[PDB]
């Protein structure tokens, strides 16, 4: 199926999921001189104090970390959305080096991985529902850039040994996301979609302004997990994001 090898991937998506070439595609670059400032813009809400993470998974493209998201935990809210959204994974996409790894970019820079806290809409019952909403979905996107390590991140890298194969999984609990969020909460906002199929265009995409740092003994530990399952030929997960994609008829909004 669909992956990030050259045989199968983003190039390739649109045979298996014409709306790769839909009108609200993600990511995208983020022209910052474009992008503009909505005064009307309110403040992100984002309540993480009571986040239950129950586990990590290695999914065979990337690693997730899963919430409980069976009552309102960890929530998001405020900004330029209308009700509640639960937390119910993050993950991230990393490169091969430190110059690319991130899905959007900021005036056509990359970044070395890019991290995504998704949280889907209360007001349609479950994430399943969600995803087939235009507004179904809130994704917060958040950079890292290379430099000193990120305190907050090592319990994740930590336990990357456990789930170096697609389908295997560990208990991640008691994990607190608010040490994944930098000093700022400025961020840039626009509609999009999912980033790997089926690229629902779901989403409504808040990326932050200002990059969380790791260092690159941390972001080395993500390159040796691998996209293939324990006792096949081993492919290490790098490179596992979409180039970015046509902004068409968006204008992306900033809140600073
Ligand atoms: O853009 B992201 O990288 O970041 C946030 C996010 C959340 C979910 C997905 N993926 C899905 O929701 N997949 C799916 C699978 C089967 C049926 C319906 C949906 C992809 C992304
Ligand atoms: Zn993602």
């Known amino acids: 199926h669909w992956g990030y090898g050259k045989h199968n991937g983003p190039e390739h998506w649109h045979k298996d999921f014409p709306i790769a070439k839909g009108e609200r595609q993600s990511p995208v670059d983020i022209d910052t001189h474009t992008a503009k400032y909505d005064p009307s813009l309110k403040p992100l809400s984002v309540s993480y104090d009571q986040a239950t993470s129950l586990r990590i998974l290695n999914n065979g493209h990337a690693f997730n970390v899963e919430f409980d998201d069976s009552q309102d935990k960890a929530v998001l809210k405020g900004g330029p959305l209308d009700g509640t959204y639960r937390l119910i994974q993050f993950h991230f996409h990393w490169g091969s080096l430190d110059g690319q790894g991130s899905e959007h970019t900021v005036d056509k820079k990359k970044y070395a991985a890019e991290l995504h806290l998704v ?20 994704v917060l996107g958040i950079f890292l850039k290379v430099g000193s390590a990120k305190p907050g991140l090592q319990k994740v890298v930590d336990v990357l040994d456990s789930i170096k194969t697609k389908g295997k999984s560990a208990d991640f609990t008691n994990f607190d996301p608010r040490g994944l969020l930098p000093e700022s909460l400025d961020y840039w906002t626009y509609p999009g979609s999912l980033t790997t199929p089926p690229l629902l265009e779901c989403v409504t995409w808040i990326v932050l302004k200002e990059p969380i740092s790791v260092s690159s003994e941390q972001v080395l530990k993500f390159r040796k997990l691998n996209f293939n399952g324990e006792g096949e030929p081993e492919e290490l997960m790098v490179d596992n994001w979409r180039p970015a994609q046509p902004l068409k008829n968006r204008q992306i909004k900033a809140s600073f």
Do not use: C, E, S
């Open 119 to 138: 949280h889907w809409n209360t007001k349609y019952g479950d994430f399943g529902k969600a995803v087939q909403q235009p507004d179904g979905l809130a």
